[PDB]
Design a protein around this ligand. Structure first.
Ligand SMILES: CC1(C)[C@@H](N(O)C(=O)Nc2ccc(Cl)cc2)N(c2ccc(Cl)cc2)C(=O)N1CC(=O)N/N=C/C=C/c1ccc([N+](=O)[O-])o1
Lengths: 60, 443, 31
């Protein structure tokens, strides 16, 4: 229980050290793409719900 | 073979021989998600009442469902049919037959779930409804499930970037976040007319009335600006950790001269640990709630969870539940510790099990390298599996641990959308972004 | 196996939505 945990911690630290962290430019690109996708999906859903609330109230 | 006669009686999306460029794929994905969003806001006909408790409130996030509307089964038929057929397989024309069986089992699951939903007590009393109303609800849900399968097959056959499941889950989560941030819905209690939307409340409170900032930020009955700040912070952190990758320099030995980088992401399994853990926890919630509703008093049901929106107070479902607020953490630190340990351990275990099952294991990646002649740049062909055995298992386990930690952090900070929701949304959007960059690099 | 495209699927979805709305309006005007 102790030795497997120590080995896992050492391996995780080594992997994090050898990973390729996102640079500013890469992080900016990923954040911009994620923000654009979230805006698209969430705002399309929000507008659909906002239109359908009066329509739902009218019909029912 | 008897499935094949019934496999042909269902429509299939026309497979485009010419590949579609990214712009039209994005436009058609937007059209598909718009259709799904419109469908999930249209209530069913014949619903007598929706004042009863909601039996499956824990599935509405992972299954992209919405109670009382056309999209009430959500994506559950697709996931159920896919899992069933994958288990059957584990136990050209072949793929056409496979897709036909997919559709047939999806329709069967849709009918079964519609019957269960009708008879479980919601929409009103099924006996008082009559045959006509319940039947009409059944056809409405059947056609809704058929449309969901058609949209998913469209996305998979190529008019869309990814799959229907991920698109619908991410779309529902993003819509929920944006609604909690910008809802014009107003609720009154006596202090005044207050907007539910967090940002809308800030504009309203300042215009109507320093305290206003405290009311908009530290509010405890409607979405807050601090909750939105936590959501943005978790978005940023999950994006940063998703960008992590291990870059193996690989060469080619068959075609002498071809150089590339094989990336082993930190989130090796993507959102699979979150999907598996959240599905398990939600199914446990549903089972415990239904058992406690009927067989209340049994010791086993009490251990499975005692409920009080009904939230657990004791039992396995309670210890699997995030703390309600900070005060919940202070009052029961033991529950917080047990939940954190469960989240991290379950996510790591699910990640390693998934790399063992799906086919991304170090042995499978080494076999793939041998099939393609790819060798690591400095490591000898002999040390191709070992250099993968030193990375892929650790990467998978640590990615599961990190994604579970991010979910715990999002839940503790009070993020709109919740840990699961936010993590699923970010992972799916990053999948779309990586598809985009792959298409751009190919060009 | 009836093979359709994306626009036919969009049309079928919109007409199903319209049919549900007409069912609702039929109920509203017959109540
Ligand atoms: C089917 C079901 C959902 C349930 N199940 O089966 C159901 O139905 N349930 C019901 C039915 C009917 C009715 Cl009516 C109601 C309810 N379950 C179960 C489990 C266990 C047991 Cl033991 C049992 C079960 C299970 O699992 N399931 C599932 C769940 O839970 N979840 N899922 C999720 C997914 C996600 C995804 C996918 C993909 C993706 N992406 O992203 O790509 O993501």
């Amino acid at each position: 229980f102790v030795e497997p945990s120590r080995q896992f911690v050492k391996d995780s630290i080594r992997l994090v050290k050898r990973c390729t962290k996102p640079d500013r430019k890469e992080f900016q690109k990923i954040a911009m793409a994620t923000a654009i996708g979230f805006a698209i999906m969430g705002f399309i859903g929000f507008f659909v719900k906002l239109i359908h609330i009066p329509i739902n109230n009218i019909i029912v | 073979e008897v499935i094949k006669p019934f496999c042909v009686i269902l429509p299939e999306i026309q497979k485009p021989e010419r590949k579609i460029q990214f712009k039209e794929k994005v436009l058609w994905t937007a059209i598909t998600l718009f259709i799904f969003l419109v469908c999930c806001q249209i209530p069913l006909f014949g619903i007598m009442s929706s004042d009863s408790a909601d039996p499956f409130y824990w599935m509405r996030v992972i299954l992209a469902s919405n109670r009382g509307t056309l999209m009430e089964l959500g994506i559950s038929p697709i996931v159920t049919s896919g899992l069933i057929m994958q288990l059957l397989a584990g136990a050209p024309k072949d793929r056409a037959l496979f897709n036909g069986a997919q559709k047939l089992f999806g329709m069967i699951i849709t009918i079964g779930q519609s019957i269960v939903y009708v008879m479980t007590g919601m929409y009103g009393d099924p006996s008082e409804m009559g045959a006509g109303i319940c039947l009409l609800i059944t056809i409405q849900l059947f056609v809704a499930g058929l449309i969901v399968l058609l949209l998913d097959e469209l996305l998979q056959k190529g008019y869309g970037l990814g799959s229907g499941i991920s698109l619908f889950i991410a779309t529902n989560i993003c819509e929920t976040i944006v609604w909690k941030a910008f809802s014009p819905t107003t609720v009154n209690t006596g202090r005044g007319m207050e907007f539910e939307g967090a940002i809308i409340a800030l504009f309203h409170l300042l215009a109507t009335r320093v305290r206003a900032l405290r009311e908009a930020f530290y509010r405890q009955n409607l979405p807050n600006l601090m909750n939105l700040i936590a959501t943005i912070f978790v978005f940023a952190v999950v994006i940063y950790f998703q960008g992590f990758r291990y870059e193996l320099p690989i060469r080619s030995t068959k075609v002498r001269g071809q150089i590339g980088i094989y990336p082993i992401k930190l989130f090796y399994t993507s959102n699979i640990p979150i999907i598996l853990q959240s599905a398990l926890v939600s199914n446990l919630y549903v089972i415990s709630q239904m058992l406690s509703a009927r067989f209340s008093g049994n010791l086993l049901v009490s251990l499975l969870g005692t409920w009080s929106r009904a939230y657990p107070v004791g039992g396995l479902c309670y210890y699997l539940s995030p703390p309600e607020s900070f005060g919940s953490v202070l009052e029961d630190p033991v529950h917080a510790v047990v939940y954190i340990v469960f989240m991290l351990g379950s996510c790591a275990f699910f990640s390693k099990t998934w790399i063992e099952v799906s086919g991304s294991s170090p042995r499978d990646i080494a076999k793939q390298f041998k099939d393609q002649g790819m060798v690591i740049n400095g490591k000898r062909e002999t040390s191709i599996y070992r250099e993968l055995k030193k990375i892929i298992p650790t990467a998978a386990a640590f990615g599961g641990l990190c994604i579970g930690a991010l979910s715990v952090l999002a839940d503790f900070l009070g993020a709109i959308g919740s840990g699961t929701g936010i993590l699923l949304a970010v992972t799916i959007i990053y999948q779309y972004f990586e598809i985009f960059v792959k298409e751009q690099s190919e060009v | 196996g009836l093979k359709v495209g994306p626009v036919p699927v969009l049309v079928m979805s919109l007409l199903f939505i319209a049919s549900v709305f007409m069912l609702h309006i039929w109920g509203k005007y017959t109540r």
